[PDB]
Amino acid sequence: RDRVPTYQYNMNFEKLGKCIIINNKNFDKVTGMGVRNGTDKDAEALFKCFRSLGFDVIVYNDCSCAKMQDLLKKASEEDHTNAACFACILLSHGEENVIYGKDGVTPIKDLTAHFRGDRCKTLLEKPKLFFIQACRGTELDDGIQ
Amino acid sequence: YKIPVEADFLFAYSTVPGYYSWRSPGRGSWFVQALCSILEEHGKDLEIMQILTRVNDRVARHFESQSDDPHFHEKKQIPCVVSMLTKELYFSQ
């Protein structure tokens, strides 16, 4: 529809922003999780897709929980002053409020907290996007009609 | 003069709380397929919420799980968008 003025995030920056992609395919036997076949297909598709949008895409593979934590903490400490927004995509196993590293599980909240307004001031007032492809429990949707 | 620390966050989950998320070994997860599909087609001219709503519709309609096991046969999926955004979001101009 109509593009009303002061109701849109300001996109006039040197660059659109960074796009972190965590592509977790393999997991340690002890977590009981299996290989996520088809994940490379998604990572490839996502990367080509976001590069096209204007983001500076970075793809990480088979990360441990500590790696995911550190990796995201470091991104939130970089200078985003010249970026319009930030984006992160997580592809892995999961349970309610949790995402799997090859290591084990870590809370989604702790991954995204690094970008709160008070902890990442160069992304303040800028949109912070997180796309999550992971299970959130074990219920099945049978459908209707 | 201040801003909430939790503001301007948007989470696009592939499924609703407590459920499974489906992934095809040959084509990839339903959510990612759909997302890329629509982004390629409208990422440069649709608001982020319009895009995700359309992704919601695509995963809901176009997909249905197929398995040898009767328990996991012909099941559905619906993505879940959580917004704390304070403005409309467009990836261009």
């Binding site: 196993h93 | 489906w22 095809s24 070994p25 997860s29 197929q66 398995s67 040898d68």
Partner: peptide, 5 residues
């Protein structure tokens, strides 16, 4: 056959 995450 589709698998789950």
């Amino acid at each position: 056959l589709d698998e789950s995450x």
